[PDB]
Amino acid sequence: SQAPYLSPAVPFSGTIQGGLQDGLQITVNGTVLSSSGTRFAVNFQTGFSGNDIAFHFNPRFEDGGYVVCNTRQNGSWGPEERKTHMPFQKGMPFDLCFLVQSSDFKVMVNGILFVQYFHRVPFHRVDTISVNGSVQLSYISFQ
Numbered sequence: 324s325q326a327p328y329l330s331p332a333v334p335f336s337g338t339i340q341g342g343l344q345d346g347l348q349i350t351v352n353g354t355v356l357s358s359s360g361t362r363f364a365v366n367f368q369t370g371f372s373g374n375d376i377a378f379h380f381n382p383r384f385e386d387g388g389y390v391v392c393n394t395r396q397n398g399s400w401g402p403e404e405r406k407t408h409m410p411f412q413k414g415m416p417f418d419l420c421f422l423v424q425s426s427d428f429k430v431m432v433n434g435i436l437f438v439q440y441f442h443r444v445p446f447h448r449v450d451t452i453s454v455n456g457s458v459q460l461s462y463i464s465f466q
C-alpha cells in the first residue's frame with residue numbers, strides 16, 4: 324500500500340516504509356544494460372549498510388549466465404544458491420516480482436516462478452531495498 328519509486332537512478336537504495344510484512348508483493352521493472360557491466364543485484368536488507376542483506380538476488384552474464392541468491396549477515400556471505408536458468412535478456416524490460424511468504428521468498432520473473440528462496444534471517448527486520456549494477460530501473464512498486 325506504498326506509493327512506488329518511479330524511474331529511480333540506479334545505484335539505488337530506498338525504503339520499504341514499514342519493513343517486509345508477510346503477504347507483501349514487490350515489483351522491480353527494469354532493463355539490463357549492454358554496458359561492460361556483466362552483473363546487477365536486487366538486495367532486500369537491513370538499512371543502507373548492505374552489510375546484512377536478508378536476500379541478495381544477483382543475476383550474472385558470465386560463465387554462460389546464472390543467478391546467485393545469498394544472504395549477508397554482519398558483512399559475511401552464507402552459502403550461495405544458484406540457478407543456471409537466466410530469465411533476462413539484455414535490452415528487454417523484465418517484470419520481476421518478489422512475493423513475501425512465511426517460509427520463503429517466491430521470485431516470479433514475468434509471472435513464472437523463477438526461484439523460491441527460504442528466509443535464513445527474519446524478514447520483518449528488512450526496511451530497505453537497494454539495486455545496483457548494469458540495470459536501469461523503470462520502477463519499484465509495493466503490493
Ligand SMILES: OC[C@H]1O[C@@H](O[C@H]2[C@H](O)[C@@H](O)[C@@H](O)O[C@@H]2CO)[C@H](O)[C@@H](O)[C@H]1O
Nearest residue numbers: 364379381391392393394400401402403
Ligand atoms: O555470493 C554472493 C556474492 O558473491 C561474491 O563473489 C563470490 C562468488 O560468487 C563465489 O563464486 C565464490 O567464489 O566466492 C566469492 C566471494 O566473494 C560477489 O562478488 C558478491 O557481489 C556477491 O554477489
